[PDB]
TrEMBL record, chains A, B, C:
Gene name per UniProt: wbqR
Designated name of the protein: Putative acetyltransferase
Keywords: Transferase
Amino-acid positions noted as binding CoA 1 in the UniProt annotation, renumbered to this chain: H147, V168, A186
InterPro entries: AcTrfase_PglD-like, PglD_N, Trans_hexapeptide_repeat, Trimer_LpxA-like_sf
UniProt binding sites for acetyl-CoA: H147
Domain PglD N-terminal: 8-80
Binding site for substrate: G71
UniProt-annotated catalytic positions: A138
Amino acid sequence: ASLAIGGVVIIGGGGHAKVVIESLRACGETVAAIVDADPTRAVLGVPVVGDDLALPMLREQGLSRLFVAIGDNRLRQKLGRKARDHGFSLVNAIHPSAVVSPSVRLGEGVAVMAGVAINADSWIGDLAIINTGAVVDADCRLGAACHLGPASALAGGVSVGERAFLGVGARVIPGVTIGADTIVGAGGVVVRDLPDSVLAIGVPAKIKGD
Amino acid sequence: ASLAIGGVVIIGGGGHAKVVIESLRACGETVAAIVDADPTRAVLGVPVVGDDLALPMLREQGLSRLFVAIGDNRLRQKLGRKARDHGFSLVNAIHPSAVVSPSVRLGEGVAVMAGVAINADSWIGDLAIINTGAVVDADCRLGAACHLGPASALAGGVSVGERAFLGVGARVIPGVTIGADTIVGAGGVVVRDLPDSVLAIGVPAKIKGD
Amino acid sequence: ASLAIGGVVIIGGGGHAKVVIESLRACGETVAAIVDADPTRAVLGVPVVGDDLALPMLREQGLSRLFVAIGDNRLRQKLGRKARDHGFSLVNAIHPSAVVSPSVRLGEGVAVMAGVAINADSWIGDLAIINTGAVVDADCRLGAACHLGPASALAGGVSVGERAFLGVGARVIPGVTIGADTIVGAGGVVVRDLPDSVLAIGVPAKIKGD
Ligand SMILES: CC(C)(COP(=O)(O)OP(=O)(O)OC[C@H]1O[C@@H](n2cnc3c(N)ncnc32)[C@H](O)[C@@H]1OP(=O)(O)O)[C@@H](O)C(=O)NCCC(=O)NCCS
Ligand SMILES: CC(C)(COP(=O)(O)OP(=O)(O)OC[C@H]1O[C@@H](n2cnc3c(N)ncnc32)[C@H](O)[C@@H]1OP(=O)(O)O)[C@@H](O)C(=O)NCCC(=O)NCCS
Ligand SMILES: CC(C)(COP(=O)(O)OP(=O)(O)OC[C@H]1O[C@@H](n2cnc3c(N)ncnc32)[C@H](O)[C@@H]1OP(=O)(O)O)[C@@H](O)C(=O)NCCC(=O)NCCS
Ligand SMILES: C[C@H]1O[C@H](OP(=O)(O)OP(=O)(O)OC[C@H]2O[C@@H](n3cnc4c(=O)[nH]c(N)nc43)[C@H](O)[C@@H]2O)[C@@H](O)[C@@H](O)[C@@H]1N
Ligand SMILES: C[C@H]1O[C@H](OP(=O)(O)OP(=O)(O)OC[C@H]2O[C@@H](n3cnc4c(=O)[nH]c(N)nc43)[C@H](O)[C@@H]2O)[C@@H](O)[C@@H](O)[C@@H]1N
Ligand SMILES: C[C@H]1O[C@H](OP(=O)(O)OP(=O)(O)OC[C@H]2O[C@@H](n3cnc4c(=O)[nH]c(N)nc43)[C@H](O)[C@@H]2O)[C@@H](O)[C@@H](O)[C@@H]1N
Ligand SMILES: [Cl-]
Ligand SMILES: [Cl-]
Ligand SMILES: [Cl-]
Ligand code: NA
């Protein structure tokens, strides 16, 4: 738990964390430490210092910036609130190759991976993930802790509910609203609104029941 | 109608205009004014000065560069001809993140959005839209006023007819020709030539009649 | 066969070569000559000097760097071995717009086109093609001489066998293994492992027999 001052604490030490670490370093930021539910190491050279019980120690030692690198959307949302309760500020991890329009509103704790484009007047909720190569056209609204998977695309005016997940290569046509907690499978093409809490797959995407 | 000299006039004041405005500003250009069929405001800080009846006034006051920011392909084509009749030059609106190969032939009034790649020896007709994240591989031929939607992709040697439209995430395999005025739905995967004036949807794309 | 010293020899003079030539020139490299099975010209200003029988002459004259610009995966693999037997080093042709993470392991003779992203801890075999706009998420393993077509995407932890081919816009969900010599059609969405030597198409991708 000997750290250098000033850097970013990461919650989570998986594959998603690797990619976030490399976005932060590409921006010139320093990653100080990881906390992981397996407290046993290092991720890309960043030390795993403990589990979430190490958060107060990290804060006391002067570290105050944090990113939640956990793919699971509800868990990420809960951990972001825990981190803020412990006095951390949630940074954004935006790869320098991402194109984020100057009229985009960004929340906090947002991941925006390499190759992303986000166009005019889009709003991006806290703790959203806009993954590698994803496209978000103008006037979209992305709720807190949703996840646009790699190579997915939203055409204009699409709203994505809190904690919704779009799989790799999913597509949404203009004006569509997708409910909270909804999953679009990989490659699904969404051509009408989706309610909350369903799973939709196919071209066109169709809701799959039990 | 008090303007600064030297900038670009925009026909259209919708969501597409927002994105074009931001491409032009990312290149260091100034947008002078919008003309919109609803002559009532501002779009991203650009004043709406009137409807298309204001074109001659704008030209007389020394403005001579124009972009047609209208998604509808036939309407865009008609408005580009009107603009040229009124003595405007049609500029291109190419986001600085777009990769346009040095052997690409570009027309005039072309939009090329953020994250696009256009490879060797492709030809891009006047008033085409190559939207956000779209890929155009080598040796493609894009007719005037066609529209490759966001995240769409053409493999090599594909020809797209005048005013054809490919929806978000559409794909075309090598060597395919798509007729004029044809629509490929979002996510459609085109594996054989399409004639003029049809609608094709699905993986693989199939023509949908009445 | 009068050449300038120091540049890259290209095997193949087709559409793929055009794109590779332009990646190399975008990096400031000089392309010295093409050898093509049709020994009859120039490709983008690069002289065709002969067929593969000209390799020893080229080496003797001091040229030692080579790229194999042949789309056919098995043929490319064979030609890369021939080139190395003749004393050439196989360079990589990585467009400057590609984002290649600093923990990616790259082989030799690899093409990485414009707009590609390759994330943390991915390994890319010799003579792989990562084509225009393709995305490779973290922890992927790409075998020698495979081809990820334009706008394709691998989510995390995907393994692609030697000489496998993914068509334009193909998608693979996390953790999937695709066998050697397997073809995924354009737009195919792979949701379970694929054995060697099959063809799979559709959303979801399904193996197509005779
Ligand atoms: C749709 C999904 C959520 C289903 O997971 P699951 O319910 O465990 O489903 P299974 O793998 O057991 O397959 C269920 C059935 O749906 C089909 N299926 C699975 N995923 C599909 C998809 N994306 N599109 C269409 N059909 C799909 C399967 O072929 C199977 O069909 P069957 O009835 O013929 O066997 C999942 O396959 C998916 O697409 N995940 C995306 C994950 C992702 O992209 N992650 C990126 C993280 S960065
Ligand atoms: C294909 C499209 C043009 C059809 O529009 P429409 O004819 O008004 O069709 P509807 O929304 O009434 O739906 C018609 C039927 O086709 C199906 N469908 C619609 N779009 C589909 C698509 N892209 N792929 C496959 N099926 C589709 C619907 O499920 C419906 O099926 P049903 O017979 O089971 O009800 C449209 O859905 C589309 O894909 N638009 C793309 C727009 C776009 O990407 N814009 C980006 C601008 S930058
Ligand atoms: C799948 C593929 C390999 C099949 O080639 P092929 O076996 O010669 O097939 P054909 O063109 O004769 O069509 C065979 C059948 O499969 C269907 N089909 C073809 N390609 C398909 C695809 N990608 N997805 C779903 N169905 C497809 C056809 O509609 C036809 O169906 P039918 O039985 O109703 O006629 C090919 O179409 C493909 O997708 N190629 C991708 C090439 C590419 O992306 N290259 C980029 C290089 S950089
Ligand atoms: C967006 C990505 O999300 C998922 O990636 P991921 O990195 O979140 O998932 P995994 O690789 O399983 O790693 C999650 C890591 O997160 C840790 N973890 C799991 N729960 C906790 C927790 O409560 N607190 C802390 N501090 N860490 C936790 C696990 O011990 C594990 O090391 C996967 O679904 C990927 O496919 C996807 N690309
Ligand atoms: C490429 C894009 O095309 C479409 O976007 P768009 O910006 O063209 O569409 P809208 O948002 O409806 O806006 C069109 C604007 O264009 C104006 N307009 C419509 N017709 C005219 C016209 O004849 N002359 C002028 N000067 N303006 C015209 C309308 O009054 C409206 O303000 C949509 O289909 C989008 O989903 C798509 N991304
Ligand atoms: C990745 C790309 O692969 C394929 O492109 P390609 O450039 O390899 O294919 P083609 O345009 O037919 O050109 C292949 C060139 O490669 C030459 N060639 C074919 N065989 C040989 C060879 O053994 N030695 C040499 N030196 N050259 C060979 C042919 O004479 C021809 O000029 C196509 O499938 C494209 O659609 C795809 N984008
Ligand atoms: Cl660091
Ligand atoms: Cl301006
Ligand atoms: Cl050169
Ligand atoms: Na892209």
